[PDB]
């Protein structure tokens, strides 16, 4: 059907079996394994398993995920642990990708994955900068994207879009200064969601 994305049962079956494989080997840390309708394997783990799970996936002969594609966070305020840590790994040997997810809150450290992937260094600095997730035993944790002395972690859902301060040059003190933000035109909030359900397959129980 020309407008519909075709399915790939072979990949779905292969990823499901590998998901069970990883779960059987590391039951100490694996909490959930799921495969999407577009065939992406996600492993959900207790945060204590970051180093062992990532190490296993990197060095095991049936895994060989040598490349860390990306490491990022998602802020979901309604969860007790609002931060979801997402590792996207790539295995060149088996031409496959995997996603490992864990969680933390504002005060609970996560273990730095720098020992497993040197790529993780700056990704963890960015996560710390944008979300305030502290990574333990990181070689050099500090801000990377935000201005020096910037207060707050802008990618949190409750951080305002335009922030709290803004900069201008002041002639009296002959330097750039920071002041509380005032907008000539306020950003206009739109309510776009239709009041009619779009996707019955995802309906949540009442």
């Amino acid at each position: 059907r020309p407008t519909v994305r075709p399915r790939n049962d072979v990949a779905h079956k292969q990823l499901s079996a590998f998901g069970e494989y990883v779960a059987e080997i590391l039951p100490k840390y694996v909490q959930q394994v799921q495969v999407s309708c577009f065939n992406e394997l996600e492993i959900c783990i207790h945060p204590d398993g970051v180093i062992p799970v990532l190490t296993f996936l990197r060095d095991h002969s049936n895994a060989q995920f040598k490349s860390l594609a990306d490491l990022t966070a998602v802020d979901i305020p309604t969860r007790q642990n609002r931060f979801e840590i997402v590792y996207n790994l790539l295995s060149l040997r088996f031409n496959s990708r995997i996603r490992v997810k864990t969680y933390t809150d504002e005060l609970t450290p996560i273990e730095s994955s720098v020992p497993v992937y040197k790529a993780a260094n700056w990704y963890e600095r960015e996560i710390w900068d944008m979300f305030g997730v502290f990574f333990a035993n990181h070689p050099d944790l500090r801000r990377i994207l935000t201005d020096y002395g910037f207060e707050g972690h802008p990618f949190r859902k409750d951080f305002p879009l335009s922030g709290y301060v803004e900069l201008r040059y002041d002639d009296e003190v002959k330097r750039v200064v920071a002041e509380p933000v005032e907008l000539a035109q306020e950003f206009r909030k739109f309510d776009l969601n239709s009041p009619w359900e779009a996707f019955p397959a995802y309906r949540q129980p009442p």
């Binding site: 305020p77 309604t78 007790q80 504002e106 859902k157 409750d158 005032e182 000539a184 306020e186």
Partner: protein, 125 residues
């Protein structure tokens, strides 16, 4: 090696928010009312947290609406009122919670349109 921390969760000192936008704000926790213009109920599923409205004024140059409120457009979504209340407390915001309003189940009968002896009989279709 876990430790015991009996204190209430309070993160106001490490969120970077200026003081005036913690102590002087009033968060409202509620389920949005159905938009009366439509019958769809899908925008009344989740709990919302919004803050108190502050001044908007006309920009002298263009007449656009200006604001000095950094939280003017801040709306947070929650699965339950308990999650919303929890979030408000750890952030130090004073809040109000409004009980979810659900339509009460109605007794509908098409046959009642043609009642032999009751006022439910309709005069037209």
């Amino acid at each position: 090696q876990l430790i015991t921390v009996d204190e209430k969760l309070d993160i106001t000192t490490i969120t970077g928010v200026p003081e005036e936008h913690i102590k002087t704000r009033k968060a409202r926790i509620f389920v949005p009312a159905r938009n009366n213009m439509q019958s769809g109920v899908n925008n009344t599923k989740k709990w919302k947290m919004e803050f108190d409205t502050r001044e908007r004024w006309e920009n002298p140059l263009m007449g656009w609406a200006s604001t000095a409120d950094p939280l003017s457009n801040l709306v947070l979504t929650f699965s339950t009122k308990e999650d919303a209340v929890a979030f408000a407390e750890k952030n130090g915001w004073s809040y109000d919670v409004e009980e979810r309003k659900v339509p009460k189940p109605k007794s509908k009968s098409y046959g009642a349109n043609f009642s032999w002896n009751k006022r439910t009989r309709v005069s037209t279709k």
